[PDB]
Curated annotation (Swiss-Prot):
Residues 2-30 form the 4Fe-4S ferredoxin-type domain. The keyword Electron transport applies. GO terms for molecular function: 4 iron, 4 sulfur cluster binding; electron transfer activity; iron ion binding. Its cofactor is [4Fe-4S] cluster. Binds 1 [4Fe-4S] cluster. It comes from Bacillus thermoproteolyticus. The keyword Nucleotide-binding does not apply. This is Ferredoxin. [4Fe-4S] cluster binds at residues 11, 14, 17, 61. Ferredoxins are iron-sulfur proteins that transfer electrons in a wide variety of metabolic reactions. PANTHER family: FERREDOXIN. The lineage of its organism: Bacteria, Bacillati, Bacillota, Bacilli, Bacillales. Keywords: 4Fe-4S, Electron transport, Iron, Iron-sulfur, Metal-binding, Transport.
Length: 81
């Protein structure tokens, strides 16, 4: 499986990820991205049909703020660092 999460501490509010993967990422009132699948907790497996969009958003993010992993993040975007 795949899980994804935004590191809100590094996001620069550029609007690219919601364009790449609108069913996965949206934004708070200040434009900081978050994963809508699971309220940015990194615990809901990304649907198979959405993985390619997820990878577009992940690869495109200018500040490497989107994380992807094969195990849940359990709330911590920096778990695998
Ligand atoms: S693409 Fe990256 S920097 Fe831009 S809004 Fe999404 S998470 Fe933030």
């Amino acid at each position: 499986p795949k899980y994804t999460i935004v590191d809100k501490e590094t996001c620069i509010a550029c609007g690219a990820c919601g364009a790449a993967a609108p069913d996965i990422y949206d934004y708070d009132e200040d434009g900081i991205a978050y994963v809508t699948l699971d309220d940015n907790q990194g615990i809901v497996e990304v649907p198979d049909i959405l993985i390619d969009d997820m990878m577009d958003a992940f690869e495109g993010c200018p500040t490497d703020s989107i994380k992807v992993a094969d195990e849940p993040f359990d709330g911590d975007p920096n778990k695998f660092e």
